[PDB]
Amino acid sequence: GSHSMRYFFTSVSRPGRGEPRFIAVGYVDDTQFVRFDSDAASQRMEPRAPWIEQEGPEYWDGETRKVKAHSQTHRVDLGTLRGYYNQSEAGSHTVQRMYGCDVGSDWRFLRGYHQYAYDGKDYIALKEDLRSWTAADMAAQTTKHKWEAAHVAEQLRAYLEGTCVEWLRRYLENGKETLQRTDAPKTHMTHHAVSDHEATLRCWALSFYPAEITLTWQRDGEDQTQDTELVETRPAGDGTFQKWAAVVVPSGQEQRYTCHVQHEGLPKPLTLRW
């Protein structure tokens, strides 16, 4: 089983008055652990998981300083991109940033990322080799030329392959009671009559962790795409996730249909039949 640590940053300009809105969040897998809201009264990096609260004053001062610094470079970025694109000063724009590392089944480094977006579209991204850049347009090419001359990639590479992996493993251990606990989906099937001739079978998957799951419907041992509906994975609000898959069947033929569930918490795939 693989693990990841991510940091997401969003900066939305306020042309009418003041400084831009800045929201930063940190994840370990599908568990959020830290936050920063420019509109909050504390103006500090705040804990969002019980296992991170054990970190000392040095950590919280270091993380607050770094996120406040980022809030200011993204304010500058919004101003620099408005100039590159020859945009109006009256409009509100968005700068997004994301970075993080993954550890493989062997528990060592798998891959690292560091990418940006402007108004919801790709701007610049660090490639898989962590040495080169992918620039989407000519405004981004200007950023690439500057970053390659400044040897920025090398500084990001040291973190992604080193410090990022080391701290992800630390968190995974300190929060093992929850972070390394796999919660298999609580499954059941419901039956709803649509008419005297047809019926809806709904296959439920509740209270699971991680979010990654596969729900498939089969008729007489083969996959069925026709007459099915599947909602996207949604959060329950307590840290767990939910999902369902339904199928319209002729009444009296429910037995031919089987729901197959795949999840990391299940040692072998689950088969449900009405």
């Binding site: 940091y7 940190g26 950590y59 270091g62 993380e63 770094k66 996120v67 610094a69 980022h70 470079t73 500058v76 970025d77 620099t80 991109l81 700068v95 970075y99 940006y116 701007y123 610049i124 950023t143 970053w147 400044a150 920025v152 500084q155 990001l156 973190y159 410090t163 990022c164 701290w167």
Partner: peptide, 10 residues
């Protein structure tokens, strides 16, 4: 923990 390298402007 976040990256301590902060000298990156677009």
């Amino acid at each position: 923990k976040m990256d301590s390298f902060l000298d990156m402007q677009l």
